[PDB]
Amino acid sequence: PAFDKPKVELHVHLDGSIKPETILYYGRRRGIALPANTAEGLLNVIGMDKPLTLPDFLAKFDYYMPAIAGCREAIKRIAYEFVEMKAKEGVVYVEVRYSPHLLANSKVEPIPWNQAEGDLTPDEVVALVGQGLQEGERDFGVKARSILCCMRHQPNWSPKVVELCKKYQQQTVVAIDLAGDETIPGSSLLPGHVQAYQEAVKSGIHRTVHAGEVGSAEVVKEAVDILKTERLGHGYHTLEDQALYNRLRQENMHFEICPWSSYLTGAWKPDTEHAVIRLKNDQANYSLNTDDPLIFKSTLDTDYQMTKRDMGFTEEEFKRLNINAAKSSFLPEDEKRELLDLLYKAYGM
Ligand SMILES: [Zn+2]
Structure with missing residues (x-):
């Protein structure tokens, strides 16, 4: 460790972050053609061993999502099982993100994963995921919060997403994200997406954006200045624009680093100095994350030992980044202080 x-x-x-044996049970009980009947072999088609491309990593979801989406018990359980997982790895606070439309099967265009029309609405998916996170926290003692994803290819969804972020603000929902295929040109300025971050600014909904993961620094630059996000998912290619980088450094922008994810998705070619090193060297505001452990065959210790032996990270630096993650969390002022006192008490400060 x-x-x-x-x-x-x-x-x-x-x-x-689904367990390959939970997928297997629901794929069977719904009679769904899964690319495998065996847990360890399911993880061989879905798991990634070498670097690929961004469209190919996103393609892996087409394998197993039909077994999960549209089924209630599967939606809530993976939430409960997710927080369980995080507990076993030493996590005291976790913000877990997901697109409620991609788990729904009714009142959604398009019905994802080639499902048939049913009765599970995006507004219902958030009430079920939140229930799993609420029961998991109570069973495993780790504070767990949802973030609701926009999809870059479906700007028609993002009007409903913020709006959902607002109905469930007093539940587990703390922010809105913009995920999906960053390789699609100009998907950051689609009108559907922009009302969403605009309505988020008015009504005080927190904002994070996948930007700079496989695109240019212009991707990050509209995320910052147009959508006015407060955190950057995979801020890697911000370092190609030093003027912008040092501006966000001066404005204490938080970067959601995912080292092992960044290697397997091709985001970081292994000949390059990883972005997180100088963001450590510049003492910037960043955190370490798993992104998708099922698909990367990872745990959070995978991402921590990638830093440690390969990028020269220390226990000292591990303390500082997790405290910065705690004060760039989307928790309210009272709970984010209570979380800082947890980490203060455990770190010897
Ligand atoms: Zn991500």
Whole structure:
């Protein structure tokens, strides 16, 4: 264990943190053609061993999402099982993100994963995921919060998403995200997406955006200045624009680093200095995350030991980034202080 103290996770998707044996049970009980009948072999088609491309990583979801989406018991259980997982790895606070439309099967265009029309609405999916997170926290003692994803290819969804972020603000929902295929040109300025971050600014909904993961620094630059996000998912290619980088450094922008994810998705070619090193060297505001452990065959200790032996991270630095993650969390002022006192008490400060 590279860092055996309480950690914080801000960027990990519920979509990509399902147990391969939970998928298997629901794929069977719904009679769904899964690319495998065996847990360890399911993880061989879905798991990634080498670097690929962004469209190919997103393609892996087409394998197993039909078994989960549209079924109630499967939706809530993976939430409960997700927080369980995070507990076993030393996480005291976790913000888990997911697209309620991609788990629904009714009142959604398009019905994802080629499902048939049913009765599970996006507004219902958030009430079921939140229930699993609420029951998990009570069983495992780790504070767990949803973030609702926009899809870059469906700007028609994002009007409903913020709006959902607002109905469930007093539940588990703390912010809105913009995920999906960043390789689609100009998907950041689609009108559907922009009302969403605009209505989020008015009504005080927190904002994070996948930006700079496989695109240019212009991707990050509209996310910052147009959508006015407060955190960057995979802020890697911000470092190609030093003027912008040092501006966000001066404005204490938080970067949601995912080291092992960044290697397997091709985001970081292994010949390059990883972005997180100088963001450590510049003492920037960043955190370490798993992104999608099922698809990357990872745990959060995978991402911590990637830093430790390969990028020269220390226990000292591990303490600082997790405290920065705690004060760039989307928790309210009272709970985010209570979380800082947890980490203060465990870190010797
Ligand atoms: Zn992500």
